[PDB]
Design a protein around this ligand. Sequence first.
Ligand code: HEM
Ligand code: HEM
Ligand code: HEM
Ligand code: HEM
Lengths: 141, 141, 145, 145
Amino acid sequence: VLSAADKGNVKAAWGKVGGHAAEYGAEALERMFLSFPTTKTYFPHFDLSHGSAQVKGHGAKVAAALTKAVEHLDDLPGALSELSDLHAHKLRVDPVNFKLLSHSLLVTLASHLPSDFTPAVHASLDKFLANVSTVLTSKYR
Amino acid sequence: VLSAADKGNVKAAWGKVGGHAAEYGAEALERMFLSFPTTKTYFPHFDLSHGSAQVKGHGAKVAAALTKAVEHLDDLPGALSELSDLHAHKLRVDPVNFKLLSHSLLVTLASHLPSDFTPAVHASLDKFLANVSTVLTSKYR
Amino acid sequence: MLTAEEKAAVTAFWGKVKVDEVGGEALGRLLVVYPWTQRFFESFGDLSTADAVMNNPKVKAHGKKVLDSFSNGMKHLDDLKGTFAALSELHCDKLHVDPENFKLLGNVLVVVLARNFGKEFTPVLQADFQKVVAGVANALAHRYH
Amino acid sequence: MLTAEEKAAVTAFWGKVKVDEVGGEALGRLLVVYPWTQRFFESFGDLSTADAVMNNPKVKAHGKKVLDSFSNGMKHLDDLKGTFAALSELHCDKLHVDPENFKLLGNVLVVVLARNFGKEFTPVLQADFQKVVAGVANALAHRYH
Ligand code: HEM
Ligand code: HEM
Ligand code: HEM
Ligand code: HEM
């Protein structure tokens, strides 16, 4: 569960990301697919080539949902309900993959934000992503 | 995150527990200490011998906390704030131990309530204990 | 892995296990409690409700096969890595099952044993079986570490 | 483990790493991001805030030793198990550190290399290092397997 400090760190860090959210979304996915190739089995219909238009278009969607989550930190189950149906009911994504993507995203943000990615921001973002992951893996209808 | 059904299932299971809560809390501790000896390192001051009155008295506290949680499923962070302070800030319990106690608890409930411990109740009790564990390992004050 | 007294207590108890009933129940409960695992059994049919999973014929049949394989491991407690070598390769290279799921099925089995046997499945007995299921889990994960 | 090309790229990159600074940051970040790990460092002193943790003299001295052991691992990528045999016994028998924590530190180290090296820590090089830290975490966990 997120403290008031966590929430402020998440909003502040995501605010710094800003317009680069889409790019970092795609790079996170690309880093996940490269480092953890079993995650690719969730996307057999995709072309997963480097620089793939599908991967990049899809990273924009993930980033947008994260933005939505950042704006609704007090009701993540409510805001992310449709994406829970998708990831938990339909796709049945193993929660380990959420840790893999979360880590890939932290790697991405760290590399692009050396000054803003402080130990405290890192902690808060890790908790936030854990929270999103829990919601997306939960059947709560 | 818990369903309406999960919440109902947890309340149903705990009604079936009845006045045996303290007894089951004690047994779950016993099973945790025996199956997972590393957990004993959090209790250097405890009499951990088989059937110790201290383990029994402690299992009654654990079970009382769990019934408090069962009574406050919409606000676990608010209900268990003091226990989060103890388990996260003070003792700093590794989250792995919470899974070991949760598993131990499920074994105990399954052994004592074989007709009421349906697969659906099992699913709901697991999520509930995972949720309690999350609150207790989180620093949010 | 186990001591001589542990193996003896563990073997004796296992002779009482109705493998069909416990195997069917364990796999079903795995799929109900950890619902993402259903993805691995997509072809088995309707897994939409608790009732459908438990009564699914392929779930029951396959659950029995798992516990036959557990029973096999029960006869080779000191050579689990060898007993499960082929299956390790299957679950990794062909099924891409994350090894954390092996632990979850191990624990489900223990809860099922407890539900089916109650008092008779004592803390000592359970403790011994925890060692067994951890051993099988690690053996099936051997391709990783 | 790694191919010859993966080994050479990983080695060349590691030569840029300021081992002492990276170790302090990584150990610090571990204690901040995953605060239960602080229990193992009870005697290190003030750990009440992120700043106190990062600036703790003992955390920094100790991160140095961690990363020095990692640098040694980097010279023995073909036999990480033998390389970390003494440390595996220490962290298990004497320290009782859950193996999950080895993976978390490995990942924190990866995040630290990313922060310190920016885009130089390419996706490919990150993937190579994901294998290394997974290999180190498993070498450390051998006393459980
Ligand atoms: C931070 C956690 C995650 C977030 C916020 C997220 C978000 C999203 C979004 C926004 C979509 C597209 C919905 C739309 O089309 O409008 C999606 C689809 C999808 N997600 Fe995720 N996701 C997460 C984690 C994961 C993980 C870890 C996996 C598996 C490795 C995964 C697998 C998929 C798949 C297979 C699709 C459908 C792809 C398609 O056909 O376009 N997701 N997700
Ligand atoms: C189901 C989750 C848990 C619940 C509901 C729970 C609840 C409690 C309660 C009610 C107390 C008594 C506090 C008081 O007397 O004011 C307590 C104390 C304590 N707990 Fe837990 N606990 C849980 C998990 C764990 C785990 C997994 C560990 C580590 C193995 C742990 C370690 C401790 C310790 C060391 C104490 C202090 C005991 C003493 O000195 O008297 N707890 N807990
Ligand atoms: C933990 C102990 C486990 C044991 C002893 C075990 C054993 C087996 C056995 C004996 C088979 C038959 C394959 C053959 O001989 O050709 C099998 C197949 C299979 N296993 Fe497991 N398994 C375990 C865990 C898991 C887990 C956790 C999963 C994840 C859901 C899984 C997924 C599968 C799948 C999808 C098949 C193929 C089913 C089919 O289409 O016929 N296994 N396993
Ligand atoms: C990448 C995995 C790790 C490596 C390579 C590593 C390396 C080391 C090294 C080189 C030492 C010094 C031993 C000596 O000087 O005798 C040490 C000690 C220690 N480690 Fe680790 N470590 C790892 C993970 C962890 C984790 C995750 C924890 C806790 C969560 C931990 C807890 C400790 C503790 C408490 C000590 C003794 C500290 C003291 O009082 O001096 N280690 N480790």
